[PDB]
Amino acid sequence: DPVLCFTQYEESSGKCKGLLGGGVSVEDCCLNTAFAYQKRSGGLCQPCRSPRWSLWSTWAPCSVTCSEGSQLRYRRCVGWNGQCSGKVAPGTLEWQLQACEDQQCCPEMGGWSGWGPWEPCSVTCSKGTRTRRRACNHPAPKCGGHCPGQAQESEACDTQQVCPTHGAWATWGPWTPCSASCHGGPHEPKETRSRKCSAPEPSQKPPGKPCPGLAYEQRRCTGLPPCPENLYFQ
Ligand SMILES: *[C@@H]1O[C@@H](C)[C@@H](O)[C@@H](O[C@@H]2O[C@H](CO)[C@@H](O)[C@H](O)[C@H]2O)[C@@H]1O
Ligand SMILES: *[C@@H]1O[C@@H](C)[C@@H](O)[C@@H](O[C@@H]2O[C@H](CO)[C@@H](O)[C@H](O)[C@H]2O)[C@@H]1O
Ligand SMILES: *[C@@H]1O[C@@H](C)[C@@H](O)[C@@H](O[C@@H]2O[C@H](CO)[C@@H](O)[C@H](O)[C@H]2O)[C@@H]1O
Ligand SMILES: *[C@H]1O[C@H](CO)[C@@H](O)[C@H](O)[C@@H]1O
Ligand SMILES: *[C@H]1O[C@H](CO)[C@@H](O)[C@H](O)[C@@H]1O
Ligand SMILES: *[C@H]1O[C@H](CO)[C@@H](O)[C@H](O)[C@@H]1O
Ligand SMILES: *[C@H]1O[C@H](CO)[C@@H](O)[C@H](O)[C@@H]1O
Ligand SMILES: *[C@H]1O[C@H](CO)[C@@H](O)[C@H](O)[C@@H]1O
Ligand SMILES: *[C@H]1O[C@H](CO)[C@@H](O)[C@H](O)[C@@H]1O
Ligand SMILES: *[C@H]1O[C@H](CO)[C@@H](O)[C@H](O)[C@@H]1O
Ligand SMILES: *[C@H]1O[C@H](CO)[C@@H](O)[C@H](O)[C@@H]1O
């Protein structure tokens, strides 16, 4: 039966390279054992060399991306007029099966436990948020698993309580004139300053914290001349 006669067998890919033409017998084509033949463009290029096992193909992908699996690789008997090792005809296949492990551990998600009690409201006046929480330990997840859903729920709470307004000091008033025009006399020269607790005034309705500290300041007046000695004659 005539066949397509190719001048080269690639071997790296099992392709029939360099077509010499068709309409010639297999015996004539394979006078040169370096040539090769196939039937039409259907494929399966067989070299004219004596039959010999090809190379083991690369390992197929593991049957599962999880835990232990199994992967194959093939090797084809290629040639003409004879047999490969195994009482094998040209064209047959030989397989090797191997235990593979893409990932050594398969994630199994867990289950939620009971909901924890609702925490109190996040604030004691005006409005805040209320939160309850649970654990992912019934059962606990294995590997990188995780329970389905959220581990905590939150929701708004209204305290029905007007917030108290706290007081803060207004700006400092002006300095008073000094108590004296000189230092060294009966009373040292002192300066005074005062401020109001009106920015903002506290409480309003519920009690508010009063303004912290003092509403006044005292200091010595510096830079004054010395008073004369009014106790004996100079
Ligand atoms: C390859 O990657 C892994 C991380 C998994 O997602 C594989 O899918 C499958 O996941 C389920 C869990 O629901 C396991 O029980 C399966 O055995 C695993 O094949 C994925 O194909
Ligand atoms: C809880 O009880 C209420 C009656 C208030 O006294 C709360 O104090 C206020 O809390 C708010 C917001 O958390 C602050 O802005 C106020 O300054 C503070 O007085 C209290 O926590
Ligand atoms: C204010 O101006 C000063 C320059 C002085 O003339 C002062 O007089 C002195 O005041 C002190 C007490 O602060 C008295 O002891 C002295 O008798 C007096 O000379 C002035 O008051
Ligand atoms: C397959 O197996 C071994 C190692 O891969 C070698 O004999 C040769 O590569 C064969 O094709
Ligand atoms: C399978 O085995 C190793 C890698 O696991 C390599 O020789 C090659 O990738 C083959 O397909
Ligand atoms: C936790 O959440 C719900 C039940 O509240 C379910 O999706 C499941 O039981 C999960 O473990
Ligand atoms: C928490 O929420 C409700 C009860 O409040 C139920 O779905 C279940 O008990 C969960 O643990
Ligand atoms: C919070 O909500 C109610 C009480 O307001 C109850 O179902 C339970 O105490 C939950 O933790
Ligand atoms: C006034 O006093 C101090 C600042 O000096 C603080 O307690 C606060 O700012 C108050 O209003
Ligand atoms: C009074 O004193 C100083 C200077 O003015 C500042 O701390 C602030 O203005 C306060 O009211
Ligand atoms: C008192 O001191 C000086 C005035 O000499 C100014 O910084 C300000 O008026 C303050 O109240």
Author numbering: 28 to 261
What does the paper say about this structure?
The point of convergence is the cleavage of the 186 kDa complement component 3 (C3) generating the C3b fragment (178 kDa) which becomes covalently associated with the activator surface. FP oligomerizes prior to secretion, and in plasma it is found in a mass distribution with roughly 25% tetramers, 50% trimers and 25% dimers.
FPc has an overall shape of an elongated closed triangle formed by the TB domain and TSR1 from one FP monomer and TSR4, TSR5, and TSR6 from the second monomer. From this triangle the N-terminal end of TSR4 extends as a short arm whereas TSR2 and TSR3 form a long extended arm. In the FPc structure, Pro255 at the C-terminal end of TSR3 and Val256 at the N-terminal end of TSR4 are separated by 136 Å reflecting that they come from two different FP monomers. The TSR6 insert folds back over TSR5 and extends with a hairpin like loop (termed the “index finger”) together with the TSR5 thumb loop at the concave face of TSR5. The numerous TSR5-TSR6 interactions support a rigid orientation between the two TSRs which is strongly bend compared to other pairs of neighboring TSRs in FP. The FPc and FPcΔ3 structures reveal hinges at the TSR1-TSR2 and TSR4-TSR5 junctions. Our FPc crystal structure reveals that Glu244 interacts electrostatically with Arg220. Negatively charged sulfated groups on host glycans may form electrostatic interactions with the C-terminal end of TSR3, where two sulfate ions are firmly bound to Arg247. A simple model of the FP dimer in concordance with classic EM pictures of FP oligomers can now be constructed starting from the FPc structure.
